[PDB]
């Protein structure tokens, strides 16, 4: 599973250890070992949500499996909660795109996960 | 729609009001409420298009519905037009990836749109 | 074909000519003329892979066709090889998401590739 956050919140407002917290929390939520989890946080972005430049975030979760109706609802609650708590972003100013990747379409270590 | 532009054009060359203009035009093109539209502009990028580092853009448009052959052609004419007029990027140095997202795969406000 | 790499490796460690090498190697691998290939390298990113922040990369290859189990394995070997050689990133700290795009869902030059 790989999680990316793009936000207009400044770098100084991203807490130390946020990347580790995301990693741990995603490991719990997906049931995957932390070793397979990648996280990417991009602050200071030029963005708008509903025309407004108040704090917001655009995110994605790519995962080989562990994607679906109920799971994505649970991920959204978890991830919006973390962004609200740590970055002071309102959940109604967060989008999260979910992608169920085929193993053959994820490259890693000179090969794919197929 | 959420619309992201990555470009090697410098930040200073992105005109004031550009995010608002994108938001407004996308609302009319896609027939979606401006309140839901997210836009993200990423200047000063290290990129090449056809091996050249002349001004270029790589973009994406994610939407729940309102994606299709004719609609995408229309969005491209619109979006290339804006990138040409405002950022001085030639339309033939722009790629835009269109994504028709399932509602179950888009998180927002602690849940999904499903 | 369009290739993006996000990495925590610093800008100064991206060698001169790297965008060209990527362009050229992708032309070879995909069979597509370099004129049709776009590349984007994003250094200095705030990232973790497996919980830690030794050099790592999250990448994507979007392509109209030329995507599949065997082809993706070959792309991964090539691209990991490049990232290892030029950016000194271990192949086992690299993810590459592969996307087979429909021509109608790629905008270019005021239209689509359909
Ligand atoms: C997140 S995308 N982890 C990578 C992976 C590899 C193999 C099986 C499941 C997940
Ligand atoms: C326009 S109303 N976009 C809302 C959206 C659609 C798909 C993914 C994220 C956000
Ligand atoms: C990479 S996405 N090149 C663009 C393209 C256009 C038409 C056919 C194949 C590839
Ligand atoms: Cl609609």
Coordinates of C-alpha atoms in Angstrom, one line a residue, chain A residues 6-7 42 45-51 58-59 67-69 72-74 76-78 80-81 90-100, chain B residues 1-4 11 14 19-20 23 33-43 62 99 101 104-114:
Chain A
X6 CA -0.6 16.8 -1.2
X7 CA -1.5 19.8 0.9
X42 CA 3.9 17.1 0.1
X45 CA 1.3 23.2 -2.4
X46 CA -0.5 25.7 -4.5
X47 CA -4.0 24.4 -4.4
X48 CA -7.7 25.2 -3.9
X49 CA -10.8 23.2 -2.8
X50 CA -14.1 24.6 -3.8
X51 CA -12.3 27.8 -4.9
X58 CA -5.6 15.8 -2.1
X59 CA -4.6 12.2 -1.4
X67 CA -9.6 -1.9 -1.4
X68 CA -13.4 -1.9 -1.5
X69 CA -16.7 -0.3 -0.4
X72 CA -12.4 2.6 1.8
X73 CA -15.0 4.1 4.1
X74 CA -12.9 3.0 7.1
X76 CA -11.3 7.6 4.9
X77 CA -12.4 8.0 8.6
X78 CA -8.9 7.0 9.7
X80 CA -9.3 12.2 7.6
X81 CA -9.0 11.9 11.3
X90 CA -11.1 19.8 7.9
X91 CA -12.4 16.4 6.6
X92 CA -14.8 18.1 4.2
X93 CA -11.7 19.6 2.5
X94 CA -10.0 16.3 1.9
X95 CA -10.2 14.0 -1.2
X96 CA -8.7 10.5 -1.1
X97 CA -8.6 8.5 -4.4
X98 CA -8.4 4.8 -3.9
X99 CA -6.8 2.4 -6.4
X100 CA -7.0 -1.4 -6.3
Chain B
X1 CA -13.4 17.3 -10.9
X2 CA -10.0 17.4 -9.3
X3 CA -7.4 18.9 -11.7
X4 CA -3.7 18.8 -11.2
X11 CA 5.9 30.1 -10.2
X14 CA 1.5 31.6 -13.0
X19 CA -6.7 28.7 -9.5
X20 CA -10.0 30.5 -9.4
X23 CA -12.2 26.2 -10.7
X33 CA -20.8 22.5 -8.4
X34 CA -17.7 24.8 -7.8
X35 CA -17.8 23.8 -4.2
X36 CA -16.6 20.2 -5.0
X37 CA -13.9 21.2 -7.5
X38 CA -10.2 20.9 -6.4
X39 CA -7.3 22.3 -8.4
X40 CA -3.6 21.9 -7.8
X41 CA -0.9 23.7 -9.7
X42 CA 2.8 22.6 -9.4
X43 CA 5.3 25.0 -11.1
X62 CA -10.3 12.8 -11.8
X99 CA -10.0 9.2 -14.8
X101 CA -13.6 7.2 -10.6
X104 CA -16.8 3.9 -3.8
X105 CA -13.2 4.7 -4.5
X106 CA -13.3 8.4 -3.6
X107 CA -12.9 9.4 0.0
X108 CA -14.2 12.7 1.4
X109 CA -15.4 14.0 4.8
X110 CA -14.7 10.8 6.8
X111 CA -16.5 8.6 4.2
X112 CA -16.8 7.9 0.5
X113 CA -19.3 9.1 -2.1
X114 CA -20.7 5.6 -2.5

